[model samples]
Target: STGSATTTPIDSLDDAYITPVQIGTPAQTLNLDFDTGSSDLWVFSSETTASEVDGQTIYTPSKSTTAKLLSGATWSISYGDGSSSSGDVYTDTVSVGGLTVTGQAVESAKKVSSSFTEDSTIDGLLGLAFSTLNTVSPTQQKTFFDNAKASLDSPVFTADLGYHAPGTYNFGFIDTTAYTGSITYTAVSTKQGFWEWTSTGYAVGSGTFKSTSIDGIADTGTTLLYLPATVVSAYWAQVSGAKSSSSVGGYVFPCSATLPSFTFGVGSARIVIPGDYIDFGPISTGSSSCFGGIQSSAGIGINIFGDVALKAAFVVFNGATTPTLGFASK
Candidate 1:
């Protein structure tokens, strides 16, 4: 027979922070950052030396009688941002909120760097972001979602964030109450793991980009929106009185004025970028210039829509049935 389960929201330290899910039992609490960029559940272990552990949360296997390490198996993960870690595999009786699942695979990272050691609040990252991006090898094992899907009430999980203090990230069951139901579903492409798209053009206020076009990808792992050079130049050209400054990389404009509204064509969906995002912080060029939302890339591959575009809409990663993404409004 199955055990009892319940879903709870995770609270962030500040409003600007992203909400993560808190997994494990009440006796042994483990706070996890739900990242869509990669697929893996890694945590620091108590066996880790204090010098190597630093600011990370170390899980004590001795405290949890059910914890068991996987024999003859090891793993290591590296991020595009130069962050990485190495560890051994283990299975334990894990619980997320009220839900309890036995024999859940988790990575116990031993060697960690200062970046992870300095972040005292984050115990470890829960990479539920994408299956393709998952660090697990097909021969090694199943993902966290692959195991949890069987226990989920609806086979659908929802993430909700509170705008004010005690901002939360909830999981497990989908709450239809907070959504508008007008969701846009995009099919997954087998080419690569990341979400990709081609832009017909860009627009500012009423003016549209008829000649210029760009291609980019949407990634939650990336912190900033990176655009190609020609596309960035064309976007700035539309904003009246927008000027280029060497200090900020992109174009700078006045933040006080009602900036132009812009949109990127993603097949049928028109993704919008608000004015607030366009007007960035002050630059060192002795000007209170708008921060260029578009950044320059070498055109090695494609541009990416980072957190800037994601904050404007509600996104649902439907990995329960097929690998798909559903977008909606809050």
Candidate 2:
């Protein structure tokens, strides 16, 4: 069966996108961040410390008749952003959109980092990356997509992230109407448990397309596009008054700067991100300096084609026998 769900940007700056998910038998609805960078369907739960439970929703296992404790199973995961959560495991009826999966591992949080508590918009995270990255010990758990793959029409899922607009995520089959033009398929390496792929190269605005191959992951969990310092510097150099600041922690420029569009090659196809999308918004409210959406991945160790780039095109995580990624201009 196929499943579809709408994902909405939680903030005006498109910091993150969230989709409603139902957990347990009675269907406790909670907005969850569908992260393609990690694997662990963890949620704020009754077991979570009250101090860590701010204004977010929590899943109660005892209230659901179908919930069963996964004895001796536990999980602990930390994100690149340093936020973390550790929990005991439980299997329950978890549904996203209209797709239902029984015996889905629902990691119940007993502790969470300060960042998770501060962010009230997301009740939890639903990992869409490879289940090999699952932090569960004693027995690693498969992701929701992994568990549902056998029942799906096709072993694939698509991401349609939008700029300041609601997007959609589809499972099992790709929606032709969701994209225009033909899809450019590329090989995916799950070596590190990520949807990692290589871009042929990139072009700054309408400039020449560099033939240098760049490896990166299609990370929905990340907010911006991070590339090698050379690529990032080449793009920012075109904008007047742009500077990589130590104080601001990234490249920042005057809010009025005329930014250039960024184009990245997916096989022979090119996806262009509008200049307006690069102006990630003011460093602070009413500030003259604005943060750049494209930053150097030097410190991060690996390049990431995050929401900034993903929003410019349609992305498919094809999970067939030989995994592949498909990108199409919309």
Candidate 3:
């Protein structure tokens, strides 16, 4: 899927919030969310009513010497989480990683909710995935990539996830020198804004087991890897000292010791999932620690290999050509 690419930093104030690395210049900074679920970049603004502006990051375009508003357009977005916001469209000279893009389109929310207003840290989200779900038209939806593409030294955008540090995510230009020439690219289906694939089987610990006809989509928006209940249970059965407990509205296990590696085979390629990903952090439920992985979705739609899985590989959505997906290393 052809799409825009950009990166931001996670805030020390909150683990769930992240903001654009830099905006405009030292005199003006724009904060945004790096989301893959959608393809639009929006930010809260001063015009937004204070009642609706409780937790959002409101940018003062008037204060920024480089900012300009799109005079005739209006935009609104409703997320899967049931939260909605509406605003006027604007154009701004935004910068990321020292690469400045002029006339980039952005949304200035006029009304926001308590959930959005309370988070004083992050300013907004930059949707850097495929273009299938973009809220604006091609003429109106200009992203950081759309402007930076011409200026970037490289043609590709590569994302690097930090395993244990603060800079877990990086974007903009990709360094092809780091990858081997044997990289495989999978064709993407354009019906939805998802990267779907057929799996031959799954490998738990050191054992390889063929799945009972499993197919799924890999989503970066979701935090956890959700598999069919049967698949999750079968996989958990093999983990050492793993026990089923009621936590986070699902089954979790104790993984204090070293956990084995798990792999999923798609076509001819085998994707390995690390143990740290499997042993997730604890949620509200006291004693039961949530497995970095989970079996919550059970009979739910399809398996969603979320961010944890995506971090393990270098993914490229080639929508400009034949809807192909590419994977490489850091």
lDDT of each: 0.58, 0.95, 0.60
Per model, state how many residue pairs clash.
Answer: 3, 0, 16
The whole-model C-alpha lDDT of candidate 2 against the native structure comes to 0.95
Instruction: List TM-scores for all candidates, in order.
Output: 0.74, 0.99, 0.78
lDDT of 1 by residue, 1-330 (tens): 122222122222121233333333334666665555566778888755578766555787766667776776576788655778767777776655545557777777877666667666667776655455656543355556657777666454444332222323334555566566466666654356555545556666576545345655555545446777766676677666777767555567775556655566544555566755555455654555656665656533657765555544556556555656555555
Model 2 poorest 10 in a row by lDDT: 275-284
Task: List model 2 lDDT by residue over 1-330, tens digit each.
Answer: 988999999899999999999999899998999999999999999999999999999999999999999999999999988899999999999998899999999999999999999999999999999999999998999999999999999999999998999999999999999999999999999999999999999999889999889999999999999999999999999999999999999999999888999999998899999998888889999999999999999999999999999999999999998899999999
| Clashing residue pairs for model 2 | none
Compose the digit string of candidate 3's lDDT tens values, residues 195-303: 6655667777778666654566655555566777777777777665666665345556663556566677655666677777566655454644545465546545667
**Model 2 lDDT at residue 209:** 96
TM-score of structure candidate 1: 0.74
> On a 0 to 100 scale, what is the lDDT of residue 164 in model 1?
25
Predicted structure 3: clash tally: 16
Among all candidates shown, the one with the greatest lDDT: 2
